[PDB]
Short mmCIF file of C-alpha atoms and ligand atoms in Angstrom, two decimals:
data_model
loop_
_atom_site.label_atom_id
_atom_site.label_comp_id
_atom_site.label_asym_id
_atom_site.label_seq_id
_atom_site.Cartn_x
_atom_site.Cartn_y
_atom_site.Cartn_z
CA UNK A 27 -5.01 12.42 14.09
CA UNK A 28 -1.76 10.71 14.48
CA UNK A 29 -0.45 6.88 14.37
CA UNK A 30 0.90 3.69 14.64
CA UNK A 31 -0.42 1.68 11.11
CA UNK A 32 0.30 -1.43 9.16
CA UNK A 33 -0.40 -3.61 5.80
CA UNK A 34 -2.17 -6.13 5.10
CA UNK A 35 -2.67 -7.97 1.51
CA UNK A 36 -4.81 -11.02 1.96
CA UNK A 37 -7.81 -9.15 3.55
CA UNK A 38 -9.93 -9.79 0.12
CA UNK A 39 -10.09 -13.53 0.17
CA UNK A 40 -8.80 -15.03 3.06
CA UNK A 41 -11.48 -16.40 5.62
CA UNK A 42 -13.38 -15.00 8.53
CA UNK A 43 -11.44 -16.73 11.17
CA UNK A 44 -7.79 -15.26 9.23
CA UNK A 45 -9.25 -11.59 8.65
CA UNK A 46 -10.62 -11.40 12.28
CA UNK A 47 -7.05 -12.44 13.14
CA UNK A 48 -5.40 -9.61 11.44
CA UNK A 49 -8.01 -7.20 12.85
CA UNK A 50 -7.77 -8.45 16.54
CA UNK A 51 -4.46 -8.26 16.04
CA UNK A 52 -4.15 -4.51 14.84
CA UNK A 53 -6.56 -3.83 18.15
CA UNK A 54 -4.46 -5.29 20.96
CA UNK A 55 -1.41 -3.98 18.88
CA UNK A 56 -2.98 -0.13 19.45
CA UNK A 57 -2.06 -0.07 15.13
CA UNK A 58 -4.79 2.27 14.23
CA UNK A 59 -4.47 1.96 10.12
CA UNK A 60 -4.68 -0.51 8.10
CA UNK A 61 -3.47 -0.64 4.44
CA UNK A 62 -5.19 -3.33 2.65
CA UNK A 63 -5.38 -4.38 -1.67
CA UNK A 64 -8.53 -3.75 -3.21
CA UNK A 65 -7.88 -5.40 -6.32
CA UNK A 66 -7.30 -8.64 -7.95
CA UNK A 67 -6.85 -8.16 -11.81
CA UNK A 68 -6.99 -11.06 -14.27
CA UNK A 69 -8.63 -14.68 -14.93
CA UNK A 70 -5.53 -16.70 -13.30
CA UNK A 71 -5.40 -14.08 -10.10
CA UNK A 72 -8.62 -14.84 -9.45
CA UNK A 73 -8.83 -18.41 -9.83
CA UNK A 74 -5.71 -18.77 -8.55
CA UNK A 75 -7.30 -17.16 -5.11
CA UNK A 76 -10.71 -18.25 -6.28
CA UNK A 77 -11.34 -14.87 -5.57
CA UNK A 78 -12.56 -12.53 -8.15
CA UNK A 79 -13.10 -8.95 -8.12
CA UNK A 80 -12.01 -8.08 -12.11
CA UNK A 81 -11.10 -11.31 -13.90
CA UNK A 82 -11.95 -9.61 -17.50
CA UNK A 83 -12.94 -5.77 -18.37
CA UNK A 84 -16.14 -4.53 -17.25
CA UNK A 85 -16.32 -8.04 -15.56
CA UNK A 86 -17.06 -6.60 -11.71
CA UNK A 87 -17.18 -9.87 -9.17
CA UNK A 88 -17.66 -13.80 -10.20
CA UNK A 89 -18.17 -14.15 -13.89
CA UNK A 90 -21.44 -15.20 -14.46
CA UNK A 91 -21.89 -18.97 -14.66
CA UNK A 92 -18.69 -19.55 -12.18
CA UNK A 93 -20.17 -21.19 -9.14
CA UNK A 94 -18.12 -22.07 -5.49
CA UNK A 95 -16.16 -18.73 -5.76
CA UNK A 96 -15.51 -16.28 -3.55
CA UNK A 97 -16.38 -12.74 -4.17
CA UNK A 98 -13.89 -9.87 -3.51
CA UNK A 99 -16.03 -7.24 -2.17
CA UNK A 100 -17.50 -9.48 -0.27
CA UNK A 101 -14.61 -10.49 1.70
CA UNK A 102 -13.58 -6.57 1.37
CA UNK A 103 -17.40 -6.17 2.50
CA UNK A 104 -16.06 -8.53 5.47
CA UNK A 105 -13.18 -6.91 6.43
CA UNK A 106 -14.63 -3.48 6.79
CA UNK A 107 -17.44 -4.09 8.46
CA UNK A 108 -15.15 -6.17 11.05
CA UNK A 109 -12.75 -2.68 10.56
CA UNK A 110 -15.87 -1.04 11.57
CA UNK A 111 -16.23 -2.91 14.70
CA UNK A 112 -13.27 -3.33 15.97
CA UNK A 113 -11.95 0.48 15.55
CA UNK A 114 -9.60 -0.11 12.53
CA UNK A 115 -9.58 2.54 9.91
CA UNK A 116 -8.47 1.46 6.39
CA UNK A 117 -6.27 2.72 3.70
CA UNK A 118 -7.63 0.92 0.38
CA UNK A 119 -5.24 0.64 -2.94
CA UNK A 120 -6.88 0.22 -6.12
CA UNK A 121 -4.40 -0.92 -8.68
CA UNK A 122 -0.84 -2.68 -7.83
CA UNK A 123 2.11 -1.26 -9.73
CA UNK A 124 3.76 -5.07 -9.52
CA UNK A 125 2.09 -8.08 -10.97
CA UNK A 126 0.73 -9.69 -8.04
CA UNK A 127 -2.87 -9.46 -8.09
CA UNK A 128 -2.27 -9.01 -11.84
CA UNK A 129 -1.52 -5.37 -11.49
CA UNK A 130 -1.48 -2.82 -14.54
CA UNK A 131 -0.01 -5.84 -16.51
CA UNK A 132 -3.04 -7.48 -16.26
CA UNK A 133 -4.26 -3.79 -17.94
CA UNK A 134 -1.93 -3.51 -20.10
CA UNK A 135 -2.25 -7.62 -22.17
CA UNK A 136 -6.68 -7.03 -21.53
CA UNK A 137 -5.52 -4.03 -23.81
CA UNK A 138 -2.84 -5.52 -25.96
CA UNK A 139 0.02 -2.94 -24.93
CA UNK A 140 3.58 -3.73 -25.07
CA UNK A 141 4.73 -2.12 -22.09
CA UNK A 142 3.72 -1.95 -18.29
CA UNK A 143 3.66 1.90 -19.11
CA UNK A 144 1.34 1.80 -21.27
CA UNK A 145 -1.27 1.58 -18.49
CA UNK A 146 -1.02 5.17 -17.83
CA UNK A 147 -1.06 5.87 -21.37
CA UNK A 148 -3.55 4.17 -23.48
CA UNK A 149 -7.35 5.71 -23.06
CA UNK A 150 -8.75 2.14 -23.71
CA UNK A 151 -7.05 1.16 -20.47
CA UNK A 152 -6.98 4.71 -18.22
CA UNK A 153 -11.23 4.35 -18.87
CA UNK A 154 -11.17 0.60 -17.42
CA UNK A 155 -9.07 1.60 -14.48
CA UNK A 156 -12.18 4.46 -13.59
CA UNK A 157 -14.85 1.88 -14.60
CA UNK A 158 -13.19 -0.98 -11.62
CA UNK A 159 -12.91 2.20 -9.03
CA UNK A 160 -16.37 4.00 -10.14
CA UNK A 161 -17.52 0.34 -9.07
CA UNK A 162 -16.05 -0.25 -5.81
CA UNK A 163 -16.32 2.74 -4.72
CA UNK A 164 -20.26 2.96 -4.97
CA UNK A 165 -20.13 -0.61 -3.80
CA UNK A 166 -22.71 -1.18 -0.93
CA UNK A 167 -21.42 -3.11 1.84
CA UNK A 168 -23.53 -6.40 2.25
CA UNK A 169 -22.46 -6.30 6.19
CA UNK A 170 -23.17 -2.45 6.87
CA UNK A 171 -25.88 -0.83 3.73
CA UNK A 172 -23.42 1.54 3.43
CA UNK A 173 -21.77 2.10 0.37
CA UNK A 174 -17.96 2.59 0.03
CA UNK A 175 -17.98 5.94 -0.62
CA UNK A 176 -19.80 6.62 2.66
CA UNK A 177 -18.02 4.95 4.82
CA UNK A 178 -15.67 6.68 7.59
CA UNK A 179 -13.98 3.21 8.33
CA UNK A 180 -12.34 3.76 5.10
CA UNK A 181 -10.21 5.97 5.24
CA UNK A 182 -8.41 7.02 2.34
CA UNK A 183 -8.47 5.68 -1.39
CA UNK A 184 -4.89 5.21 -3.13
CA UNK A 185 -4.37 5.18 -6.61
CA UNK A 186 -1.57 2.60 -7.39
CA UNK A 187 0.60 0.85 -5.00
CA UNK A 188 3.93 1.59 -5.40
CA UNK A 189 3.05 3.27 -9.04
CA UNK A 190 6.71 3.88 -11.39
CA UNK A 191 7.15 4.71 -14.54
CA UNK A 192 10.84 4.05 -15.77
CA UNK A 193 9.99 5.14 -19.30
CA UNK A 194 9.39 8.68 -18.65
CA UNK A 195 11.93 9.89 -16.63
CA UNK A 196 10.85 13.30 -16.73
CA UNK A 197 8.38 12.17 -14.19
CA UNK A 198 5.61 14.01 -16.36
CA UNK A 199 3.76 10.92 -17.52
CA UNK A 200 2.83 10.19 -13.51
CA UNK A 201 2.05 13.64 -12.77
CA UNK A 202 -0.79 14.10 -15.89
CA UNK A 203 -1.98 10.15 -14.34
CA UNK A 204 -2.49 11.31 -10.76
CA UNK A 205 -3.92 14.62 -11.93
CA UNK A 206 -6.60 12.67 -14.00
CA UNK A 207 -7.19 9.54 -11.77
CA UNK A 208 -7.08 11.58 -8.13
CA UNK A 209 -9.33 13.97 -9.83
CA UNK A 210 -11.72 11.84 -11.18
CA UNK A 211 -12.15 9.70 -7.29
CA UNK A 212 -12.98 13.13 -6.39
CA UNK A 213 -15.57 13.41 -8.20
CA UNK A 214 -16.59 10.05 -7.41
CA UNK A 215 -16.44 10.83 -3.67
CA UNK A 216 -15.77 14.44 -2.22
CA UNK A 217 -15.84 12.37 1.76
CA UNK A 218 -12.86 10.17 1.55
CA UNK A 219 -8.91 11.06 1.36
CA UNK A 220 -6.92 10.72 -1.93
CA UNK A 221 -3.14 10.18 -1.70
CA UNK A 222 -1.00 8.36 -4.46
CA UNK A 223 0.45 5.17 -3.01
CA UNK A 224 3.69 5.35 -4.22
CA UNK A 225 7.40 4.74 -3.02
CA UNK A 226 8.41 8.64 -2.64
CA UNK A 227 10.96 8.48 -4.79
CA UNK A 228 12.88 11.92 -6.03
CA UNK A 229 13.74 13.21 -9.46
CA UNK A 230 16.94 15.28 -8.55
CA UNK A 231 16.32 18.24 -6.10
CA UNK A 232 18.49 20.82 -5.66
CA UNK A 233 20.15 19.44 -1.60
CA UNK A 234 18.94 16.32 -1.59
CA UNK A 235 21.15 13.19 -1.94
CA UNK A 236 21.34 10.06 -0.77
CA UNK A 237 22.72 9.06 2.66
CA UNK A 238 26.56 7.40 1.62
CA UNK A 239 25.52 7.83 -2.47
CA UNK A 240 23.34 4.61 -2.27
CA UNK A 241 20.41 4.17 -3.97
CA UNK A 242 20.94 7.40 -6.23
CA UNK A 243 18.29 6.08 -8.05
CA UNK A 244 15.71 6.33 -5.44
CA UNK A 245 16.95 10.47 -5.33
CA UNK A 246 17.43 11.28 -8.88
CA UNK A 247 13.81 9.94 -10.96
CA UNK A 248 15.09 6.53 -12.65
CA UNK A 249 11.79 5.41 -11.62
CA UNK A 250 9.33 8.41 -13.28
CA UNK A 251 8.60 9.28 -9.59
CA UNK A 252 8.89 12.85 -8.88
CA UNK A 253 7.03 12.79 -5.11
CA UNK A 254 7.36 16.41 -4.89
CA UNK A 255 5.17 17.40 -8.10
CA UNK A 256 2.42 14.48 -7.01
CA UNK A 257 2.50 15.77 -3.36
CA UNK A 258 1.42 19.46 -4.83
CA UNK A 259 -1.41 18.64 -6.57
CA UNK A 260 -4.19 19.76 -5.94
CA UNK A 261 -6.58 16.49 -5.39
CA UNK A 262 -3.98 14.62 -3.54
CA UNK A 263 -4.57 14.58 -0.39
CA UNK A 264 -1.25 12.92 2.04
CA UNK A 265 2.05 12.63 0.48
CA UNK A 266 3.28 8.60 0.89
CA UNK A 267 6.49 6.97 0.35
CA UNK A 268 7.74 3.23 1.91
CA UNK A 269 11.42 2.44 2.66
CA UNK A 270 13.53 -0.61 1.77
CA UNK A 271 17.03 0.30 2.07
CA UNK A 272 17.70 -3.94 1.73
CA UNK A 273 16.01 -3.94 -1.93
CA UNK A 274 17.64 -0.99 -3.35
CA UNK A 275 21.11 -1.16 -3.21
CA UNK A 276 22.16 0.76 0.47
CA UNK A 277 24.58 -1.63 2.75
CA UNK A 278 23.70 -2.93 5.63
CA UNK A 279 25.84 -0.86 7.59
CA UNK A 280 24.47 2.28 5.91
CA UNK A 281 20.14 0.93 6.28
CA UNK A 282 19.59 2.61 9.49
CA UNK A 283 21.03 6.20 8.54
CA UNK A 284 19.89 5.98 4.97
CA UNK A 285 16.19 5.48 6.14
CA UNK A 286 16.69 8.17 8.39
CA UNK A 287 17.70 10.84 6.13
CA UNK A 288 14.86 9.42 3.80
CA UNK A 289 12.32 10.09 6.42
CA UNK A 290 13.90 13.50 7.32
CA UNK A 291 14.03 14.10 3.60
CA UNK A 292 10.30 13.66 2.63
CA UNK A 293 8.99 14.86 5.91
CA UNK A 294 10.78 18.24 5.08
CA UNK A 295 9.45 18.31 1.56
CA UNK A 296 5.84 17.40 2.97
CA UNK A 297 6.29 19.92 5.72
CA UNK A 298 7.24 22.46 3.11
CA UNK A 299 4.39 21.91 0.87
CA UNK A 300 2.27 21.52 3.80
CA UNK A 301 0.31 18.42 3.71
CA UNK A 302 0.55 15.00 5.68
CA UNK A 303 3.06 12.63 4.91
CA UNK A 304 3.07 9.12 5.78
CA UNK A 305 6.30 6.41 5.97
CA UNK A 306 3.54 3.95 5.21
CA UNK A 307 5.61 0.72 4.49
CA UNK A 308 8.73 0.50 6.04
CA UNK A 309 10.58 -3.01 6.22
CA UNK A 310 14.54 -4.57 6.72
CA UNK A 311 14.74 -8.10 6.40
CA UNK A 312 14.63 -10.46 9.84
CA UNK A 313 17.71 -11.65 8.80
CA UNK A 314 19.95 -8.62 8.47
CA UNK A 315 23.05 -8.56 10.07
CA UNK A 316 21.76 -5.82 12.34
CA UNK A 317 19.38 -4.85 15.25
CA UNK A 318 16.17 -5.14 13.22
CA UNK A 319 14.01 -3.64 16.27
CA UNK A 320 16.53 -0.58 16.80
CA UNK A 321 16.20 0.02 13.30
CA UNK A 322 12.60 0.62 13.49
CA UNK A 323 13.42 2.55 16.90
CA UNK A 324 15.05 4.80 15.41
CA UNK A 325 13.12 5.35 12.01
CA UNK A 326 9.87 5.66 14.43
CA UNK A 327 11.41 7.96 16.81
CA UNK A 328 11.97 10.26 13.37
CA UNK A 329 8.76 10.27 12.20
CA UNK A 330 7.05 10.99 16.03
CA UNK A 331 10.13 13.43 16.35
CA UNK A 332 9.81 15.46 13.19
CA UNK A 333 5.73 15.53 13.30
CA UNK A 334 5.50 12.90 10.75
CA UNK A 335 1.42 11.64 10.76
CA UNK A 336 2.01 8.11 10.75
CA UNK A 337 4.50 5.44 10.30
CA UNK A 338 3.09 1.98 8.79
CA UNK A 339 5.14 -1.42 8.91
CA UNK A 340 5.13 -4.32 6.46
CA UNK A 341 3.34 -6.00 7.53
CA UNK A 342 1.37 -7.48 9.76
CA UNK A 343 -0.40 -11.28 10.12
CA UNK A 344 -2.94 -13.23 12.37
CA UNK A 345 -3.00 -17.05 12.16
CA UNK A 346 -2.70 -19.22 9.06
CA UNK A 347 -4.68 -21.93 7.25
CA UNK A 348 -4.46 -24.73 5.17
CA UNK A 349 -1.62 -24.40 3.27
CA UNK A 350 -0.73 -21.03 4.80
CA UNK A 351 0.03 -22.20 8.10
CA UNK A 352 3.62 -21.78 9.43
CA UNK A 353 5.41 -24.43 11.95
CA UNK A 354 3.35 -21.67 15.05
CA UNK A 355 -0.08 -21.89 12.72
CA UNK A 356 0.73 -18.62 11.95
CA UNK A 357 0.35 -17.36 8.39
CA UNK A 358 3.97 -17.92 7.22
CA UNK A 359 6.85 -15.22 7.06
CA UNK A 360 6.96 -15.43 3.68
CA UNK A 361 9.53 -12.44 2.69
CA UNK A 362 11.25 -12.09 6.14
CA UNK A 363 9.31 -8.49 7.12
CA UNK A 364 6.66 -10.29 9.25
CA UNK A 365 5.30 -9.33 12.40
CA UNK A 366 2.25 -10.72 14.45
CA UNK A 367 1.05 -9.95 17.84
CA UNK A 368 3.73 -12.19 19.67
CA UNK A 369 6.59 -11.88 21.89
CA UNK A 370 8.97 -10.92 19.34
CA UNK A 371 11.01 -7.36 20.19
CA UNK A 372 9.54 -5.71 17.00
CA UNK A 373 6.15 -7.05 18.36
CA UNK A 374 6.60 -5.28 21.94
CA UNK A 375 8.04 -2.39 19.94
CA UNK A 376 4.60 -1.72 17.93
CA UNK A 377 2.84 -1.90 21.01
CA UNK A 378 4.90 0.71 23.11
CA UNK A 379 5.17 3.35 20.22
CA UNK A 380 1.55 2.80 19.54
CA UNK A 381 0.76 3.87 22.97
CA UNK A 382 2.67 7.27 21.95
CA UNK A 383 1.53 8.21 18.70
O1 BGC B 401 10.95 -4.86 -8.19
C1 BGC B 401 12.27 -4.46 -7.33
C2 BGC B 401 11.32 -3.95 -6.03
O2 BGC B 401 10.11 -4.65 -6.13
C3 BGC B 401 8.81 -4.66 -5.27
O3 BGC B 401 8.49 -6.05 -5.15
C4 BGC B 401 9.11 -3.64 -3.77
O4 BGC B 401 8.37 -3.65 -3.03
C5 BGC B 401 10.28 -2.68 -4.49
O5 BGC B 401 11.00 -2.74 -2.76
C6 BGC B 401 11.53 -3.30 -4.90
O6 BGC B 401 12.66 -2.16 -5.35
#
């Protein structure tokens, strides 16, 4: 199974109209897999979206006594049931490295820690993450009757979006945490694939250096991620990597070749370990002084020709509503990476490549 995929982060708190639009757009475009968030941590983040998943330790869903709120499990249930109908598979990520939707720092605040990376080390935090993930994976979808652990529309669980641990540049903290949590998920759900959801950083591997000497930190272990070691974990089924040369220090004239080398290196390493590998987020800003579609074509050709298992752009949006609606009625392009199902050269490229993979 090889595919063109995408990402959408608002499938657990927006309306039926808006969810139907993203999933219908994916089906129309040929996008087979959508990577979505399965978390909403912290009372302030829940209140901001009027949607509750994990507002406090041991509270899953809407707090007793709060009325007029959405339950993010019910919105995720609706998303899964519609994806099932429309033939879209879902990768569902279980916490954010970043503060959007609470993330690791929200868990550290709950447990009175002092650094983001206490999330990997404090046993009280690790226990709360396992309680959350157990609740989610055992949750019975209210539109299908099928618990998520038995739902084939879900392709994979992912431990943590873009996990990093800068406080341990040896890589060992993340290896231990990924071993513990991926084994834990397999103990709950022996059916589904498990992956990490990280960006794919290397930790000073002989003969792997960045294109053009830019963004060395992504090759030399700065983030505390040793991707090869993570991919070798028995309870990890496939490797994930992300690609944003414009965020990482690469010059615009080097975005294409830096990204090309990044894809080549990840596929070579995963092929030697013998597990599948997915480029699960990539993006070039709409305003970059290069042809974004030709970069996306180059990177999709490389994944296709080198035998990578999937290429997933960040990100796909559909129609918008309320305060999230732009000049054409769509959910707005807030970050410069949005693609929608229109006549843009990027949308045309995605439709063309979805026919190939
Ligand atoms: O904070 C810097 C990092 O921020 C994240 O939001 C992005 O996804 C990364 O690409 C970036 O390196």
